[PDB]
Design an enzyme around this catalytic site. Sequence first.
Site, PDB file in Angstrom:
ATOM      1  N   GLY A  17       0.796  -1.204   0.000  1.00 10.42           N
ATOM      2  CA  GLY A  17       0.000   0.000   0.000  1.00 10.42           C
ATOM      3  C   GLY A  17       0.834   1.261   0.000  1.00 10.42           C
ATOM      4  CD  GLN A  18       0.641   6.467  -0.854  1.00 14.90           C
ATOM      5  OE1 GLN A  18      -0.036   6.030  -1.778  1.00 14.90           O
ATOM      6  NE2 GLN A  18       1.751   7.174  -1.049  1.00 14.90           N
ATOM      7  N   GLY A  20       4.055   0.855   1.748  1.00 17.99           N
ATOM      8  CA  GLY A  20       4.860  -0.307   1.454  1.00 17.99           C
ATOM      9  C   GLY A  20       4.196  -1.625   1.798  1.00 17.99           C
ATOM     10  CE1 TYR A  82      -5.221 -11.223   7.012  1.00 18.61           C
ATOM     11  CE2 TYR A  82      -6.568 -12.947   7.950  1.00 18.61           C
ATOM     12  CZ  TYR A  82      -5.880 -12.420   6.893  1.00 18.61           C
ATOM     13  OH  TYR A  82      -5.854 -13.063   5.677  1.00 18.61           O
ATOM     14  CG  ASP A 127      -7.850   7.668   1.324  1.00 15.29           C
ATOM     15  OD1 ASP A 127      -8.767   7.612   0.501  1.00 15.29           O
ATOM     16  OD2 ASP A 127      -6.678   7.291   1.048  1.00 15.29           O
ATOM     17  NE  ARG A 131      -8.519   4.379  -2.050  1.00 21.32           N
ATOM     18  CZ  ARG A 131      -9.465   5.216  -2.471  1.00 21.32           C
ATOM     19  NH1 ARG A 131     -10.401   4.821  -3.330  1.00 21.32           N
ATOM     20  NH2 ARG A 131      -9.475   6.465  -2.035  1.00 21.32           N
ATOM     21  CG  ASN A 132      -8.402   3.157   2.347  1.00 23.68           C
ATOM     22  OD1 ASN A 132      -7.497   2.358   2.121  1.00 23.68           O
ATOM     23  ND2 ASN A 132      -8.373   4.379   1.902  1.00 23.68           N
ATOM     24  CG  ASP A 145      -5.504   1.684   6.440  1.00 25.64           C
ATOM     25  OD1 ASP A 145      -4.493   1.430   7.111  1.00 25.64           O
ATOM     26  OD2 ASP A 145      -6.086   0.860   5.700  1.00 25.64           O
TER      27      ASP A 145
HETATM   28  C1  LIG Z   1      -7.095 -12.130   1.896  1.00 25.13           C
HETATM   29  C2  LIG Z   1      -6.627 -10.800   2.447  1.00 25.13           C
HETATM   30  C3  LIG Z   1      -6.925 -10.469   3.746  1.00 25.13           C
HETATM   31  C4  LIG Z   1      -6.401  -9.189   3.857  1.00 25.13           C
HETATM   32  N1  LIG Z   1      -6.499  -8.407   4.980  1.00 25.13           N
HETATM   33  C5  LIG Z   1      -5.900  -7.206   5.232  1.00 25.13           C
HETATM   34  C6  LIG Z   1      -5.204  -6.389   4.338  1.00 25.13           C
HETATM   35  C7  LIG Z   1      -4.670  -5.178   4.771  1.00 25.13           C
HETATM   36  C8  LIG Z   1      -3.954  -4.280   3.822  1.00 25.13           C
HETATM   37  C9  LIG Z   1      -3.163  -4.825   2.824  1.00 25.13           C
HETATM   38  C10 LIG Z   1      -2.521  -4.001   1.911  1.00 25.13           C
HETATM   39  C11 LIG Z   1      -2.711  -2.648   2.002  1.00 25.13           C
HETATM   40  F1  LIG Z   1      -2.111  -1.832   1.104  1.00 25.13           F
HETATM   41  C12 LIG Z   1      -3.502  -2.069   2.947  1.00 25.13           C
HETATM   42  N2  LIG Z   1      -3.696  -0.664   3.029  1.00 25.13           N
HETATM   43  C13 LIG Z   1      -2.692   0.179   3.298  1.00 25.13           C
HETATM   44  O1  LIG Z   1      -1.567  -0.298   3.479  1.00 25.13           O
HETATM   45  C14 LIG Z   1      -2.914   1.652   3.405  1.00 25.13           C
HETATM   46  C15 LIG Z   1      -3.992   2.357   3.205  1.00 25.13           C
HETATM   47  C16 LIG Z   1      -3.872   3.639   3.401  1.00 25.13           C
HETATM   48  C17 LIG Z   1      -2.631   3.960   3.804  1.00 25.13           C
HETATM   49  S1  LIG Z   1      -1.627   2.618   3.907  1.00 25.13           S
HETATM   50  C18 LIG Z   1      -2.159   5.363   4.125  1.00 25.13           C
HETATM   51  C19 LIG Z   1      -3.121   6.387   3.532  1.00 25.13           C
HETATM   52  C20 LIG Z   1      -4.556   6.010   3.896  1.00 25.13           C
HETATM   53  C21 LIG Z   1      -4.972   4.697   3.246  1.00 25.13           C
HETATM   54  C22 LIG Z   1      -4.149  -2.897   3.863  1.00 25.13           C
HETATM   55  F2  LIG Z   1      -4.914  -2.331   4.789  1.00 25.13           F
HETATM   56  N3  LIG Z   1      -4.839  -4.761   6.026  1.00 25.13           N
HETATM   57  N4  LIG Z   1      -5.527  -5.551   6.954  1.00 25.13           N
HETATM   58  C23 LIG Z   1      -6.065  -6.700   6.586  1.00 25.13           C
HETATM   59  O2  LIG Z   1      -6.681  -7.395   7.444  1.00 25.13           O
HETATM   60  N5  LIG Z   1      -5.812  -8.756   2.741  1.00 25.13           N
HETATM   61  N6  LIG Z   1      -5.945  -9.817   1.888  1.00 25.13           N
HETATM   62  C24 LIG Z   1      -5.383  -9.662   0.529  1.00 25.13           C
END
Ligand SMILES: Cc1cc(Nc2cc(-c3ccc(F)c(NC(=O)c4cc5c(s4)CCCC5)c3F)n[nH]c2=O)nn1C
Length: 264
Positions: A17-18, A20, A82, A127, A131-132, A145
């Site tokens: 994500g944003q 890493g 999670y 935000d 997606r969030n 987030d």
């Molecule tokens: C099957 C499965 C379950 C599952 N569960 C989860 C995924 C993630 C998660 C993963 C990658 C991400 F990119 C992000 N978002 C970010 O990092 C950010 C968002 C924002 C940031 S950073 C800063 C600016 C504001 C918005 C996640 F939240 N978290 N928690 C979970 O439980 N994923 N999968 C594929």
Amino acid sequence: WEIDPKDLTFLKELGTGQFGVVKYGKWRGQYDVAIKMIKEGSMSEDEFIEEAKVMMNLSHEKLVQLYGVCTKQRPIFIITEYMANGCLLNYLREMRHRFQTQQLLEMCKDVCEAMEYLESKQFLHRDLAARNCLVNDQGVVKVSDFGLSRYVLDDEYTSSVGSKFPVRWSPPEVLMYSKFSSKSDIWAFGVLMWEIYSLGKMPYERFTNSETAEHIAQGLRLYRPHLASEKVYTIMYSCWHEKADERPTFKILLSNILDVMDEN
Ligand SMILES: Cc1cc(Nc2cc(-c3ccc(F)c(NC(=O)c4cc5c(s4)CCCC5)c3F)n[nH]c2=O)nn1C
């Protein structure tokens, strides 16, 4: 709450994500957690740790629960509840043909309850979007987030003309003046309701970000999705008053949603 990194077991990659890389793991061998490993240079870290206490104190069933942070090493870690079904946008798209309308409304209620809690604490998400939001193994939607956009170091995300800025979830006063408030979260919530009822379509598809900004400035609004009743559309549309002070509060939106449920 400073988590001891020795208490974390990494298990699976969850994507990027944003900030890493994000991993799935366990805390103390038992609790399923997501762990953001904060990429160096991606976050205003002093700023984040400075203001981290208020986030520790936000607690609601429909908010993703913070477990804590690891700040004594780099990369910094953020540890959260999670959510086994991942983010709401992909969940909508992957399960599109299974949802009943009552389930769509319940998802909106879940998010609205979390946002009414944040509103009561004068805490801005900044935000909010499908997606969030995250979905657990029982289909409950929770808001994720919240507040983190404030710490992003990436001009493509922080500038309103950047490629990553959440233009399609932003009201006119954010796009023109960067005036974030509870009422800009209200606008975003309306767009989120639209994402839910469209079963995960992209808002203003085929419009660029700047065309989106231009058209909402001139009064264009997202169309009513097929699965949204008139009463449901009236709720999401109320979030999109041009003037921020005419938009409802999350308390009012929650009451509207409950009223629709009761009628059903
Ligand atoms: C099957 C499965 C379950 C599952 N569960 C989860 C995924 C993630 C998660 C993963 C990658 C991400 F990119 C992000 N978002 C970010 O990092 C950010 C968002 C924002 C940031 S950073 C800063 C600016 C504001 C918005 C996640 F939240 N978290 N928690 C979970 O439980 N994923 N999968 C594929």
